[PDB]
């Protein structure tokens, strides 16, 4: 009964999670068969990342994701692709790019002069 897992990492005030494929009977931080993704709640955009091919292979062979894993798969589109109902839709929002400090400095120097 292989299931998709989330493992707590990081200090107390900023949790981080590893999207892991492992047996259900093991511990929360037990031995991991493979790592395929990650999840960072703290950042307000909630950066997401999953290995598409490996996730599709695991779903095909018959792993059962938990509720949050299923939510992530739906929002990323892997679940939609596997089921074939709507197709492959990307609802993920990308991290807002940090403007280049080089050009921040250039604008600041131009304003100064």
């Amino acid at each position: 009964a292989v299931k998709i897992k989330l493992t707590r990492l990081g200090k107390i005030r900023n949790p981080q999670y590893r999207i892991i494929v492992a047996d259900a009977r093991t511990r929360r931080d037990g031995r991991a068969i493979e790592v395929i993704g990650r999840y960072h709640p703290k950042e307000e955009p909630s950066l997401i990342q999953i290995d598409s091919e490996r996730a599709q292979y695991w779903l095909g062979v018959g792993a059962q994701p938990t509720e949050p894993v299923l939510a992530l798969l739906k929002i990323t589109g892997d679940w939609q692709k596997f089921k074939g109902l709507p197709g492959a839709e990307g609802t993920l929002k990308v991290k807002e790019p940090k403007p280049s400090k080089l050009d921040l400095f250039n604008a600041a120097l131009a304003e100064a002069e």
Partner: protein, 200 residues
């Protein structure tokens, strides 16, 4: 826990002026104490300790941080001397002092602790703040209208700003560009004795 004792006492004991404007130092160069005139036996250990004391009590840094900086600079692939000098110069208090904005390192340290500066548009109040390569420092309007800030900025006739620091406008907006070199820094004292002392 900073040092709250007299400042000229340490300069007198070490025999080399630290602030540079000490009139009492030139009035009396000999060290304090009842028997300050007695001769002292030569000791490489003595000179090595003296250099450390001079540097640390001139920069007003705590020796735990000083030792950590030594370890970092030594492990850094550069040469321990100039790496330590640069990492210690990168101190925010020393930066603001050598920018001409402050007349004393203790003034810089106190003002920074009270939090009268802005960095990257984010409020920072830490005298031991790390300023890396190619950064920027700003100043808030409260500090701009603060009294001593003014007197300082329109009385800034101190030693010329080094190459790596430079001001561009009346707002006292400070800059750092590259890693300074030993000769260009041209700071008093000698770090060979300090590195030998720690290697011992």
């Amino acid at each position: 826990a900073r040092y709250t004792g007299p400042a000229t006492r340490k300069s007198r004991r070490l025999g080399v002026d630290l602030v540079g404007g000490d009139q009492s130092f030139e009035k009396r160069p000999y060290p304090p104490g009842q028997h300050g005139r007695a001769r002292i036996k030569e000791s490489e250990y003595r000179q090595q300790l003296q250099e450390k004391q001079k540097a640390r009590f001139s920069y007003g840094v705590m020796e735990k941080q000083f030792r950590r900086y030594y370890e970092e600079a030594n492990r850094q692939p550069g040469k321990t001397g100039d790496n330590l000098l640069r990492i210690l110069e990168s101190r925010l208090d020393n930066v603001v002092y050598r920018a001409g904005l402050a007349r004393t390192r203790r003034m810089a340290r106190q003002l920074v602790s009270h939090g009268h500066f802005l960095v990257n548009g984010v409020k920072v109040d830490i005298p031991s703040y790390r300023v890396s390569q190619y950064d920027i420092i700003d100043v808030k309007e409260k500090s701009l209208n603060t009294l001593p800030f003014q007197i300082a900025r329109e009385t800034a006739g101190e030693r010329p700003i080094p190459s790596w620091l430079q001001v561009v406008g009346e707002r006292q907006r400070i800059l750092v560009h590259q890693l300074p070199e030993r000769a260009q820094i041209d700071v008093p004292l000698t770090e060979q004795l300090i590195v030998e002392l720690y290697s011992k």
